[PDB]
Symmetry: C4
């Protein structure tokens, strides 16, 4: 019964609270370590607290692997994420895809995986992504076409902003966010190219509409997924859609119609 | 019957109108007192009008405490708020948590507590907060991780904007609001750190999405709570949800099905 | 039958098209008159076209007053608006509440009153205003409290932005719109008052939320009112709410329950 | 059976994938051609790859015209668009309505027409436009009235921003987007015209509300149209509205009421 006694401990509220308190503590020490003025002894102390925090996470994950099984633990995405986050910190010479995994503060993302209500918010957002993939692709297509056009049109006269494809993608993102789009970019561009507005004004109209569509699509779907997940976590099931309720109401009416026309 | 005669006065439309007119008058005199050019006599006069306004609020709250009872009055959050707002002004040497309670203009917040339709708007907003707590926590987590990262990454080269955790939290809030994010912050940062966009562009994408989710969540829930509260204030009850209407419609169909299969 | 023959002309599509074409023509000549470089003869010609346009509107409104009756015409807000717009132009020495009614281009607002689909959009927006009055009042209260606070706190050190109540209302509106709020206003203010963010960041959080609530409230209600008005204009009636459909469905079930329990 | 064998090839997933891969390849070579530093041989090579890509699109469209028929192919808007996009590239001396069709990168818009999920997003957006035409017209009317007013009011003192109708339309679009509206435009204008805020603040209030209404109207309708189109593409039909489900439920209740009152 040892593994079962350990699962009862792991799945308890107090154990979740201890682990949450250690993530907050680890997050607090990493925040204090951003302070350049600190003494060597103060830094050494905080680095030992970070070591103590990480060790508690190793015991916890090992306690989880034994109480669930290697395949049973890695079955959940949140468990694998927690494993990767902790295991990465135990690698001195590491390699990913950017530069170096020196951002230890990403360990505070564990607050999301450990707290179930927070876990459900991220879950809802992630599950809402496939449904907006075509809107996001449409926005990606518009950005690329615009970046190529802006490079060819304005790159030779405005090389800081449109000198290459990378530079144009960056200033088009800025233009889309409406940040200094006119006083900083388009009015100076119009001094050399007077009809530049025929490009930037339709670019703004299209991208702000498409990006708002993308964001609304995520928020609307994510809110409904999380709402359903909150219901299943509390009652064991979620509220059935209006269409299903009306379908079952229609079936009951077809059943009474049969028990009236011939056998009545 | 004295306390009952006083409640009939307190709960009347005319009494509410008199108190509203005194809050507007007190608000108007505090606004005139912002004028530095005013004579000593004009300031003295307006300060006596503020004293007269506050005295009317003391009589009103005392009239309320007697007509409801100490425990009956303090049972409502709006009554306690009105009590605190008025009582605070009668304290010369006060202490809270900031610097000093010299902002007497917060007395105009009583317009919200005294006007029931306005009271319902704030009520709807306040009751909508627990439901967005996890989205707000997710935004708080993202801000903290980002602030620590920005301090470590850019603090030594950009100390005005990222020199410490407090400075980084402030400029990340600015970046999230899209205010001069590129012309003022990220283009100057990219001159020293060319890949800074890999940090700021995903930061903007994530936070604008999460903050919009937080705001939409508040507005959608608050509007429904206020709508229900407006219905209960006018008719005594609110409109039942579609799910409940369909549930009772389903019960009526189960009742007629029973009165058809066997006893018919 | 003369008045009835005139109403058939007035209410026709062709007459509406002629009047629309004259508003567009009048709008086009007023736009050409903004050009400072024009000759005296060109200006004189366009001013005569504006005179011809206005005369057509006088004949039209007079044709409407006779075919409906003085009280019958003025019964509609759109007819009174059309009357005021045209009649105002026939007054040389006029007085309203601002400076002078020299903005003749407001005559292009008649495109809204003459085109029924456009008339319904404005109608929906106007009818949606009472329902957001308390949200708008809440925003007005927050602005006033903030303006008084900003005047007292920052007026002596920042008189251009906060020197008086009017100046503070203006820069708080700018701060609410997020326009240069940090690089232009709050960072310079924080150089003198380091804790200024404790005021401006909660001000931004509260006002952007309240203004979004105000706008969403208008758009959601206006869209539903216009939708109903579009239905009534095409079919003579609008779609009944789901609550009413379920109410009548419930009444039919109560009727069959009565015709089953006792008399069956 | 030749035309039928060709349609089976055209309508297959693999053929769609080959054409998609060629659009991506053509898009990639046009993006590489924005690079000014490239050698003459590298440019020549990429220009031949663009020629090869375009030739594959000619074979594909010709294969489509034969397998469907001239009138059958041109029956679809997407086929005509694909035809125009490819055929335009085979014209050396061309003329449209702007300057010159040198933006070959518009060929990447074929990703939208070739991918059905992407085709449905654009379809939903395009079909949602007639329904917002009156809101867009209302915004067009407000812009024109404002542009004429701004030209007459501020053109002589601010000719860069309001010197003519075109200049005023441009800076009003900027003001509507809230870009440097106060620090860049209205504060400098108020130094000469102190009551300029009476014009710009109501202009901002009205246009941001109307533009948000326009965008929300597009997103809400487009999302529902695309959702219905996604359902019809997968199952052959779409989900019926709640109103229709309740209508058929009401008809079933009227049918059982008839089979109870007289013949029971
Ligand atoms: C969905 C939209 C996604 C937009 C993504 C844009 C990223 C492109 C940014 C990039 O790759 N750069 C090159 C990195 O080497 C940045 C350039 O803009 C940079 O060269 C200039 O800004 C310099 O002037 C540095 O200040
Ligand atoms: C959810 C997001 C919440 C963001 C909240 C950010 C508040 C942090 C602001 C703060 O604590 N500061 C230190 C107060 O002492 C402000 C600093 O940014 C300030 O030191 C610099 O701006 C100076 O250069 C003054 O001009
Ligand atoms: C719901 C929010 C509503 C906000 C409305 C704000 C309007 C207040 C503007 C006003 O009354 N002013 C005084 C008009 O005399 C404008 C001042 O701001 C002005 O004195 C300064 O800006 C000068 O420096 C001129 O450049
Ligand atoms: C729904 C709203 C639609 C707004 C559309 C606005 C377009 C008008 C722009 C235009 O026609 N211009 C004239 C083109 O010749 C641009 C001017 O603004 C330009 O003359 C000045 O900006 C110069 O100073 C150049 O820097
Ligand atoms: Na903005
Ligand atoms: Na800005
Ligand atoms: Na700016």
């Amino acid at each position: 019964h040892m593994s079962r006694k350990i699962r009862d401990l792991i799945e308890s509220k107090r154990f979740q609270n201890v682990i949450t308190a250690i993530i907050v503590l680890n997050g607090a020490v990493l925040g204090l370590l951003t302070d350049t003025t600190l003494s060597a002894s103060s830094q050494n102390l905080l680095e030992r607290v970070d070591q103590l925090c990480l060790t508690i996470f190793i015991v916890e994950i090992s306690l989880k692997i034994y109480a669930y099984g290697v395949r049973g633990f890695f079955r959940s995405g949140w468990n694998l994420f927690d494993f990767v986050i902790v295991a990465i910190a135990l690698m001195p010479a590491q390699g990913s895809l950017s530069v170096l995994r020196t951002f230890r503060i990403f360990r505070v993302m564990r607050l999301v995986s450990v707290i179930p209500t927070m876990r459900r918010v991220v879950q809802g957002m992630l599950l809402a992504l496939p449904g907006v993939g075509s809107v996001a692709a449409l926005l990606t297509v518009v950005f690329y076409i615009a970046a190529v056009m802006a490079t060819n049109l304005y790159g030779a006269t405005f090389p800081e902003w449109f000198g290459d494809l990378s530079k144009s993608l960056y200033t088009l993102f800025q233009v889309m966010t409406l940040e200094s789009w006119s006083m900083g970019i388009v009015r100076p561009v119009m001094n050399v190219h007077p009809n530049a507005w025929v490009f930037f004004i339709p670019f703004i109209m299209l991208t702000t509409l498409t990006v708002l569509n993308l964001f609304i699509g995520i928020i609307v779907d994510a809110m409904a997924i999380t709402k359903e997940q909150e219901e299943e976590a509390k009652t064991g099931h979620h509220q059935e859609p209006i269409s299903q309720t009306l379908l079952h109401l229609g079936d009951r009416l077809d059943r009474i119609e049969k028990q009236l026309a011939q056998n009545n």
